[PDB]
Amino acid sequence: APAPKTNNCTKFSYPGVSPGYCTERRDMKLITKFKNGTKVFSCPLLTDICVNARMSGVWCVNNSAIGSLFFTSTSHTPPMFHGFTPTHHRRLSGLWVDYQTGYLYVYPNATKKPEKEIYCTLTICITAITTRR
Amino acid sequence: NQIDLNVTCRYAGVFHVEKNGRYSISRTEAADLCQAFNSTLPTMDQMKLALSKGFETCRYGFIEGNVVIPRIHPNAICAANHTGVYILVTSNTSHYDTYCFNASAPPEEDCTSVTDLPNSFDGPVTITIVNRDGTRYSKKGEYRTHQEDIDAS
């Protein structure tokens, strides 16, 4: 089963985003595709940045949220996944989130164009530093 | 055309305005919207005072010089479990909500209904203020002074 391979810490700051600031990206990455046609997608994490930060992902299907993901990173570890919280009330048709990784499995009958109808809204916020006024 | 404006209570004069149920306010429209409410884009100091009086949202909105989100309680999907005022790095063309500061509001929390856009002007739009209690107040007019905002729909 697909799961992240932890990269070495390569960068120790997030390019262009200072402590006290956040940035958002709407995209997803194809992690793997199986012989049966099922595709597995991830939020678009930058996996080699070791900065003190927290992140949310939201799986967006046709501009409606199906659930949210929480991550953290530090000066010692790249982004680490801390769980998925479902927000959908109807059962998902042809989709399944792996609760161990936050990856989204898209079965072939869910849609012919997953890359156009689905994305993750990934928000990274660089934790503020405590200083004097 | 119709414009719906959902407004929060005021906290040290600061309130949040969401247009049409989605992120839909440009930088230029945000200032014009606050001015129609006889208000201005908050300074960061005004936002921090509002936060200390009970103001938080889970939405990005314009203030003077930045787009921000104010947080009191940690929530994993609102500035990713942070507290304080966090600033969003964004293109100047992106649309968000807006914050506004009313100088005649009380120092604490004011949840009375907002019943008018006092500085709206003539125009064809039905503009509806939607309050937290469910009451809505509608008038015909306009508040956008930039033709680009009107043309962009």
Ligand SMILES: *[C@@H]1O[C@H](CO)[C@@H](O[C@@H]2O[C@H](CO)[C@@H](O[C@@H]3O[C@H](CO[C@H]4O[C@H](CO)[C@@H](O)[C@H](O[C@H]5O[C@H](CO)[C@@H](O)[C@H](O)[C@@H]5O)[C@@H]4O)[C@@H](O)[C@H](O[C@H]4O[C@H](CO)[C@@H](O)[C@H](O)[C@@H]4O[C@H]4O[C@H](CO)[C@@H](O)[C@H](O)[C@@H]4O)[C@@H]3O)[C@H](O)[C@H]2NC(C)=O)[C@H](O)[C@H]1NC(C)=O
């Ligand atoms: C195209 O092919 C790909 C590749 O084969 C398929 O991908 C698979 O997709 C399925 C889901 O459709 C994945 O299965 C699910 O995996 C969950 C996670 O499992 C892992 O973690 C748990 C906990 O640590 C372990 O127990 C698991 O161990 C299992 O696997 C190892 C080896 O991998 C074995 O040694 C074990 O014996 C186990 O077999 C994994 O390590 C897992 O939690 C989930 O299990 C639930 O669902 C099944 C039935 O679907 C039940 O048998 C099971 O008891 C669980 O039941 C709970 O949930 C159901 C669903 O709501 C409820 O009804 C129950 O009441 C209960 O609450 C499931 O097994 C699988 O991981 C994944 N494989 C890979 C390689 O990625 C695609 O599906 C396929 N596409 C199509 C369209 O068929």
Ligand SMILES: *[C@@H]1O[C@H](CO)[C@@H](O[C@@H]2O[C@H](CO)[C@@H](O)[C@H](O)[C@H]2NC(C)=O)[C@H](O)[C@H]1NC(C)=O
């Ligand atoms: C996103 O929305 C589109 C449009 O509603 C969905 O496309 C429909 O998919 C169903 C599959 O049951 C087809 O029967 C319809 O003909 C499709 N409609 C159109 C206009 O293409 C799409 O499935 C949705 N995506 C997901 C993943 O839910």
Ligand SMILES: *[C@H]1O[C@H](CO)[C@H](O)[C@H](O[C@@H]2O[C@H](CO)[C@H](O)[C@H](O)[C@H]2O)[C@H]1NC(C)=O
């Ligand atoms: C202390 O100095 C800091 C710069 O070295 C910075 O100006 C800081 O202000 C805070 O910075 C945070 C990000 O690290 C947030 O943006 C926060 O909103 C902001 O007040 C200074 N702290 C104080 C208390 O003034």
Ligand SMILES: *[C@@H]1O[C@H](CO)[C@@H](O)[C@H](O)[C@H]1NC(C)=O
């Ligand atoms: C980390 O760096 C070493 C040294 O270059 C390399 O051999 C190794 O593959 C890397 N490890 C990981 C987990 O990426």
Ligand SMILES: *[C@@H]1O[C@H](CO)[C@@H](O)[C@H](O)[C@H]1NC(C)=O
């Ligand atoms: C799609 O396939 C899944 C998995 O077998 C199934 O649960 C779902 O009902 C199918 N139908 C549609 C229309 O998605």
